[PDB]
Symmetry: none
Subunit: 131 residues, 2 copies
Amino acid sequence: CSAPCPQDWIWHGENCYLFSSGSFNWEKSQEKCLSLDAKLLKINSTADLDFIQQAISYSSFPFWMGLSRRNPSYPWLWEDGSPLMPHLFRVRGAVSQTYPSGTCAYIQRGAVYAENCILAAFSICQKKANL
Amino acid sequence: RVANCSAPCPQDWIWHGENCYLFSSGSFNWEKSQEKCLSLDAKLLKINSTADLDFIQQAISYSSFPFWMGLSRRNPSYPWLWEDGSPLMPHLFRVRGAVSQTYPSGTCAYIQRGAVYAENCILAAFSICQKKANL
């Protein structure tokens, strides 16, 4: 018998969620989730979105999620190469631009926005809960 | 009925050390915040150890918001008391700011950016509930 999640994480449904300790570019944030046996946030449902917004409701920080694209001719995809399911959210912000290191999505103050991947943000990591 | 593998804390709470913590998702007055914790068979935050303080300081570092704790002072002639009736010990913090007889329902304490302040209990803030972890 092990706890579903380590101390300091939030257990929700099948997963465990953690806010990153620091603010880094998307690539570094991805590496830091991987080091914790985790991945960047993947939103599969509006229930997941509502859970995350309630968890970040007290923060004004931007948090990277695992969604990115090279440029606007590419669809948004999660780190695992799966697609963004429809009717979850509309990515706002910098959606028409091409950045040398791609465009990445973050959640901030109740909405999802596109940004240049080289800029810094906090991030949310997630991993499967031990059930 | 007897659990196969009891989790330390319920879903949506955060486990740290001996306790479970539940951060609110909105701002409410102290009485409504107290009621919410009681409804869950829990209580408002009681920072009683260095482990509790270190955890809360890190968790609230993502926020500029105030979070009510379970500490209040009926009127300036009375002491600060936790919801359990115990006194405020001087080890971890003092409550900064004003206590006033003009406040209709006493003065309450909140933690904000690591420090603890006094405020009129009828004002709205985020809050934190706590209960013992099932270890």
